[PDB]
């Protein structure tokens, strides 16, 4: 299957079937975070998806083609995490991003806490465009989790 949409990334190497992450199929390319697959090939039914581009520092990887997602947070509006937790139905969570301030610029960040296997879930703007992927972040003084809105370059 190559239909656009959000997909679970599963493995049967561990006990039972384990969800290690999530990703986005768009324009024939599968997008997820590097730490989910570590750059390894993927199976899609009887087909094979080979890695095409990846970068550990960005924590991103694309399959079958170059990175296609290029929408960006507008810095003002609420967004929605389309969270796909392990063993649970996809659900939209609306939030106003905060900001990661870095020496190389600012990026949006979402203060939402989900299981590790939710890594790669897409964050969307009000037009439904994917502005980044969830799952690379920091733990705050409160112990809470905050994920960068991680977007590639098209």
């Amino acid at each position: 299957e190559t239909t656009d949409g959000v997909y679970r990334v599963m493995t049967r190497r561990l006990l039972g079937s384990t969800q290690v992450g999530v990703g986005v199929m768009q324009e024939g390319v599968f997008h997820t975070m590097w730490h989910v697959t570590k750059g390894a090939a993927l199976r899609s039914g009887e087909g094979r998806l080979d890695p095409y581009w990846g970068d550990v520092k960005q924590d991103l990887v694309s399959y079958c083609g170059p990175w296609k997602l290029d929408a960006a947070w507008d810095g003002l509006s609420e967004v929605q995490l389309l969270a796909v937790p392990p063993g649970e139905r996809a659900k939209n969570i609306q939030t106003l991003p905060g900001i990661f301030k870095t020496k190389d610029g600012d990026i949006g960040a979402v203060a939402l806490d989900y299981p590790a296997g939710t890594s790669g879930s897409p964050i969307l703007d009000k037009c439904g465009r994917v502005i980044g992927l969830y799952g690379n972040g920091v733990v705050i003084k409160n112990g809470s989790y905050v994920s960068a809105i991680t977007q590639g370059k098209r």
């Binding site: 949409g5 997909y7 990334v9 199976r43 939209n92 969570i93 609306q94 106003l96």
Partner: protein
């Protein structure tokens, strides 16, 4: 060996639950792709 399974369309949900705050955080990104808090 990993495989993918479709989980839905990518669409905005009109009546989604709304939660989460909006912290402004000084962070650093290292060569391994890990973010750290700068304090």
């Amino acid at each position: 060996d990993m495989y993918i399974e479709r989980a839905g369309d990518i669409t905005w949900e009109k009546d989604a639950e709304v939660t989460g705050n909006s912290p402004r955080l000084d962070v650093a990104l290292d060569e391994s792709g890990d973010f750290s808090l700068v304090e």
